[PDB]
């Protein structure tokens, strides 16, 4: 029954307009009353009446502009007030009485205040839910700008003011709100979900009106308060419907501007406390302090007045809002803490104790919240994941994240994968913004932040970042860091410490390389190193206990390097002692010959750069690496060992002879290349035994050709030759 | 040949008069000269002469002022309550056209010329040219209205009627003696509801009463069908009423107009539920003609 109601309107408005052109208003008034007789239907859906609402609201708008020009130039048909009050059908009457009425406001501003007051009393003549609203909404359109105001020109024949405007439209509004509640209670009990979807359809009908209330600008901060605020608040407490308040309580703070909200939080939060229990409170209060942040953010305006300290009240009153809330999921509660943290960050970025207290209160929120150990699968996790991110990202200094007092007490409820990864997110962030020199105010807490992280390659990454993050310029507290890192890093176990202890050794290296500069400053410089070296050695011994072979060799070596490079007293036997210690692990523990090579070769590279040892323990290990040379299994490395043992005689012919015999102790191609090395070993010490060159140079020429030509001798056949071209030192 | 004489009656004051009009049967309306109580009736009765040569044997011409009422469509039940007579011509002969002026004294006109359902009250000038066999009668009707004023007392009617344990209302009417251009103002005050009223209203029934004694005829006629609270309200709601009487044009009350009939005007509150049950209450108003002051 939707369509033909619109069409029969158009048939009768056709006879209306042809009577509007023929100066037959009354026949057109007869033609319109037949058309307006259609609009009384209740057999339509709330969308069907609304599309039929603007249907005649253009047709009578032809009749509306019909009566206006007639009165303007002097064709004033008098007494039009009761002229449209004849028949017994009120939608023919009142829709015509709207058009005449807003004309009789226009044509008689001496009856402006009267007819604005009178027709809304006549608008009480029908209490139907559907058809009164579309009447009352069309009222607002015809009474848009005709409402009286201080903002009106100076002609002494008008009646009414802004108060006559605001009260009458609230008298429109107070009708229209319960009419939305009268939508909730019309029809059978089978269409209530058909209602409440169509209740959300026609909810913006009354939503037109407070927009018209918002366009008033002569209303000040007080004139809104004691009338227009409470005259909106009255429908809030007296709607008696849950789906009523949801569109409306936003639309107050949505449409009425910023300066109206400032002191008036306290009753509006009491009005939020006055809401029904069944409502979605969540989308409200986030949008509530949406504008106050926007009033804080905006330039070229008033901004937040510091007298209404929003911090001291929103913490209290929106708590009292949840104190009025009875049966809510708790993720709605800390979605306010999403705001209550964040708003404190923007209003007082400077203030220490304010943002210190809210999280402390939020811990004291969770001190009462009898909840489980916070896993990942719930929705309360990801919001809490969002919460602690706002310190670590959005703090000015990210050291102030670490300077937070009650920080780590919040950190205790999390899940095993989360509590590590957020600290990993913390340890990434305190690195990714690169911080400088650190002191004991934030040293220990970070070590307690990794205490949330230990009790992987990322752990391999972050810890090597961590002492690179916890390197400082204080000498001995940084040593106690290297203690208390490792003492904490011993609490992790063994599987991660196999990677992460050598950076602490590398720290302890660089600590000694930080301790090596203060020779002008302090004379206790030598004492710390061997203490730290033993502390490194015990860290090595921890890795010895952690069943690692190839690494603590080098950590002994680079330790013996770090022993050998400093020169603090009694390092050399430790240098040699650990060299021996490592050599002992080499000759005992390490089994693979190639790594044993890679040990014993780099051992000589350490032993050459030990240029650090005196000969009285060198020549022991020079014999012992020659013993370790005999500990080797394959030939050439051992030949390469004794070749390099001649550099440990740096003997001359002694070493050469030994190497020669060893190279003679064995694929003949693989032999003779080493004789060229033996030549170049001789050549090297020749460039510092004259005919042993000339003996061996001719000696290579006879075992050079006697072989199969393959892909590998040919480069070596050249490698023989240019060596003799190198021997051209002229 | 047709008629020989026609009576034409023109008033001496046939210009400064109107007194509105209405009405008659088959939708017709009577507009005549409007008279009131105590006014004199002065005029001229003119005879129309059309055929020259014929001489008219007459034995008397007079005019009777008639104030009469008509009831039950029979000739013998007619009663002329006021009859003043002016003689016009002596028994003689007639040659040309002749006019007859007439001017009586105090013309008491006790009630309104009012035409109801079975009752017509009328005033007319009855001229009687008496001839040998049949007489000439010309009926020139004259409307007369009854003027009562704004009374000293016009009381607030009020009553809390309704249905026991189904509907409690409280009706009210501010006046009782209304005039014909008054406005009908009242209020309704709900107290209790149990039945599901849809939308219903107010009735205006004009009760003209005919018959004397045990023989009394009662006819049903309803002029208007107004509205009400237009719904099924609960406690705390009322119904504002603005009703104009000018859209119906009623006559005055004039109870027991001249010992044979009356006319009265009543209000009925009928309220209709979804099963269309009819629930009524009868209350009279009084009407009387407000004169243009």
């Amino acid at each position: 029954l939707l369509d033909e109601a619109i069409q029969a309107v158009k048939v009768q408005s056709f006879q209306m307009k042809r009577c509007l052109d023929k100066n037959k208003l009354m026949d057109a008034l007869k033609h319109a009353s037949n058309m307006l007789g259609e609009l009384r239907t209740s057999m339509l859906s709330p969308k069907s009446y609304y599309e039929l609402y603007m249907a005649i609201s253009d047709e009578l708008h032809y009749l509306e502009v019909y009566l206006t020009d007639e009165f303007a130039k002097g064709r004033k048909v008098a007494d039009l007030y009761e002229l449209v009050q004849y028949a017994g059908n009120i939608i023919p009457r009142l829709y015509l009485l709207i058009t005449v009425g807003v004309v009789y406001v226009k044509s008689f501003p001496q009856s402006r205040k009267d007819i604005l007051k009178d027709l809304v009393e006549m608008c009480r003549g029908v209490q139907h839910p559907l058809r009164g609203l579309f009447l009352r909404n069309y009222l607002l359109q015809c009474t848009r700008n005709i409402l009286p105001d201080e903002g009106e020109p100076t002609d002494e024949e008008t009646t009414g003011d802004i108060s006559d405007s605001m009260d009458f439209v609230l008298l429109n509004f107070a009708e229209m709100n319960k009419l939305w509640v009268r939508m909730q209670h019309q029809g059978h009990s089978r269409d209530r979900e058909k209602r409440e979807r169509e209740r959300q359809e026609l909810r913006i009908l009354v939503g037109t009106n407070l927009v018209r209330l918002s366009q008033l600008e002569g209303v000040n901060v007080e004139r809104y308060k004691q009338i227009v605020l409470t005259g909106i608040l009255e429908q809030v407490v007296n709607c008696r419907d849950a789906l009523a308040q949801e569109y409306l309580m936003e639309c107050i703070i949505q449409v009425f501007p910023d300066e109206f909200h400032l002191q008036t939080l306290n009753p509006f939060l009491r009005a939020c406390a006055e809401l029904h229990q069944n409502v979605n409170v969540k989308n409200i209060i986030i949008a509530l302090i949406d504008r106050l942040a926007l009033f804080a953010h905006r330039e070229d305006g008033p901004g937040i007045p510091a007298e209404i300290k929003l911090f001291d009240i929103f913490s209290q009153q929106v708590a009292t809002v949840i104190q009025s809330r009875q049966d809510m999921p708790s993720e709605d509660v800390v979605s306010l803490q999403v705001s209550l943290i964040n708003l404190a960050m923007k209003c007082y970025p400077d203030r220490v104790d304010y943002v210190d207290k809210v999280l402390e209160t939020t811990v004291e929120i969770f001190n009462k919240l009898n909840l489980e150990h916070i896993a990942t699968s719930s929705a309360v996790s990801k919001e809490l994941t969002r919460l602690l991110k706002i310190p670590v990202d959005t703090y000015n200094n990210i050291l102030t994240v670490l300077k937070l007092k009650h920080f780590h007490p919040l950190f205790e409820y999390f899940d095993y994968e989360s509590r590590k990864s957020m600290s990993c997110y913390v340890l990434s962030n305190v690195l990714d913004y690169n911080t400088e020199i650190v002191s004991q105010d934030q040293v220990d807490s970070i070590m307690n932040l990794v205490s949330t992280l230990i009790q992987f390659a990322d752990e391999q990454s972050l810890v090597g970042r961590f002492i690179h993050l916890l390197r400082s310029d204080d000498p001995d507290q940084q040593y106690l860091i290297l203690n208390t890192a490792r003492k904490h890093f011993g609490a992790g176990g063994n599987q991660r410490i196999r990677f992460t202890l050598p950076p602490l050794v590398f720290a302890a290296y660089q600590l000694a390389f930080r301790y090596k500069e203060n020779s002008q400053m302090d004379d206790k410089w030598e004492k710390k190193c061997q203490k730290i070296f033993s502390f490194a050695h015990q860290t090595i011994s921890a890795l010895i206990k952690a069943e690692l072979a190839e690494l603590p060799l080098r950590l002994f070596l680079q330790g013996a390097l770090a022993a050998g490079e400093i020169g603090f007293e009694n390092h050399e036997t430790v240098a040699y002692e650990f060299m021996s210690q490592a050599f002992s692990l080499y000759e005992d523990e390490i089994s693979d010959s190639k790594a044993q090579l890679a040990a014993i070769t780099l051992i000589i590279g350490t032993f050459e750069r030990m240029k650090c040892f005196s000969e009285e323990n060198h020549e022991p290990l020079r014999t012992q690496c020659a013993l370790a040379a005999s500990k080797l299994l394959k030939k050439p490395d051992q030949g390469r060992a004794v070749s390099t043992c001649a550099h440990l005689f740096w003997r001359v012919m002694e070493c050469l002879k030994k190497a020669l015999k060893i190279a003679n102790q064995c694929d003949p191609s693989l032999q003779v290349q080493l004789f060229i090395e033996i030549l170049n070993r001789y050549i090297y010490f020749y460039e510092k035994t004259i005919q042993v060159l000339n003996q061996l140079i001719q000696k290579i020429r006879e075992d050079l050709p006697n072989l199969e030509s393959s892909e590998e001798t040919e480069q070596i056949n050249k490698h023989f030759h240019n060596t003799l071209e190198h021997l051209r030192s002229r | 040949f047709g008629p020989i004489c026609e009576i034409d009656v023109a008033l001496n004051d046939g210009e400064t008069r109107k007194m509105a009009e209405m009405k008659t049967e088959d939708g017709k309306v009577e507009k005549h000269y409007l008279f009131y109580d105590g006014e004199s009736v002065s005029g001229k009765v003119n005879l129309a002469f059309k055929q020259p040569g014929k001489r008219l044997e007459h034995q008397g011409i007079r005019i009777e002022f008639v104030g009469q009422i008509e009831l039950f469509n029979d000739k013998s039940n007619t009663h002329e309550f006021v009859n003043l007579v002016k003689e016009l011509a002596l028994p003689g002969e007639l040659t040309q056209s002749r006019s007859y002026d007439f001017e009586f004294m105090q013309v008491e006109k006790p009630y309104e010329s009012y035409i109801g359902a079975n009752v017509r009250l009328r005033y007319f000038l009855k001229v009687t040219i008496v001839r040998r066999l049949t007489d000439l009668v010309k009926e020139y009707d004259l409307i007369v209205h009854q003027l009562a004023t704004y009374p000293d007392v016009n009381n607030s009617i009020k009553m809390e009627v309704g249905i026991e344990d189904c509907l409690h209302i409280e009706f009210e009417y501010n006046k009782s003696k209304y005039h014909l251009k008054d406005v009908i103002v009242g209020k309704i005050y709900f107290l209790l509801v149990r039945i599901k009223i849809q939308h219903m209203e107010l009735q205006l029934i004009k009760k003209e009463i005919t018959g004397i004694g045990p023989s009394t005829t009662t006819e049903t006629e309803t002029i208007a069908k107004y509205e009400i609270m237009d719904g099924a309200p609960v406690k705390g709601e009322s119904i504002p009423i603005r009703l104009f009487l000018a859209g119906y044009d009623p006559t005055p009350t004039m109870r027991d107009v001249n010992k044979k009939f009356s006319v009265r005007y009543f209000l009925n509150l009928v309220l209709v539920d979804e099963e269309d049950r009819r629930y009524f209450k009868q209350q009279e108003i009084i009407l009387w003609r407000k004169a243009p002051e």
Binding site: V463, R465, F506, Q558, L561, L602, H647, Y684 | -
Partner: protein, 179 residues
């Protein structure tokens, strides 16, 4: 363009690259990346993975990823390029590295392990020791300067060494062609 580097020591001796180097090591420009080793983490190599794909690295002593080779020999363009990490050089300091070149039949060598930048030519064969792109610390050498090196067209390789001196990046450039 061919990126040359070595001895990252992440997280071993250092952790923080020059951001000056990070912007000069934006991906897309270089074709090949040649590190000596001692990267000490996969993610130190996986940073280099972002820069380019054509990468070949050999094993260092602190390469705890023990699957990199001992040496590497490759030919692209007209150059026959060999590479070592430099720890198997005994002793570090010298002519003796040219003896390593004689084993492998190359014309461009890369060494490392001393963490200083140097690159040079002898016996008409080239040798690289690019130093540490991280500025990874050296045992014997306390003061450390970061530098990465990065162009074979045809018988001619253009060599840009991007060093970190002062407060900017001091790029040096010498030319060497296949003779």
């Amino acid at each position: 363009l061919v990126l040359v580097l070595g001895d990252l020591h992440i997280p071993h001796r250092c952790n923080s690259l020059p951001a000056k180097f990070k912007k000069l090591l934006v991906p897309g420009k270089i074709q090949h990346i040649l590190c000596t080793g001692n990267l000490c983490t996969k993610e130190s190599y996986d940073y280099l993975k972002t820069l380019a794909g054509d990468v070949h690295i050999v094993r260092g002593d602190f390469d705890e990823n023990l699957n990199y080779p001992e040496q590497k020999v490759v030919t692209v363009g007209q150059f026959k390029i060999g590479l070592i990490h430099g720890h198997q050089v005994i002793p570090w300091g010298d002519a003796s590295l040219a003896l390593l070149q004689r084993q492998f039949d190359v014309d461009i060598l890369i060494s490392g392990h001393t963490h200083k930048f140097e690159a040079f030519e002898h016996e008409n064969k080239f040798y690289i020791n690019p130093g540490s792109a991280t500025g990874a610390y050296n045992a014997l050498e306390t003061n450390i300067i970061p530098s990465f090196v990065l162009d074979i067209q045809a018988s001619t390789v253009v060599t840009y060494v991007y060093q970190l001196i002062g407060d900017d990046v001091k790029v040096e450039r010498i030319e060497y062609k296949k003779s």
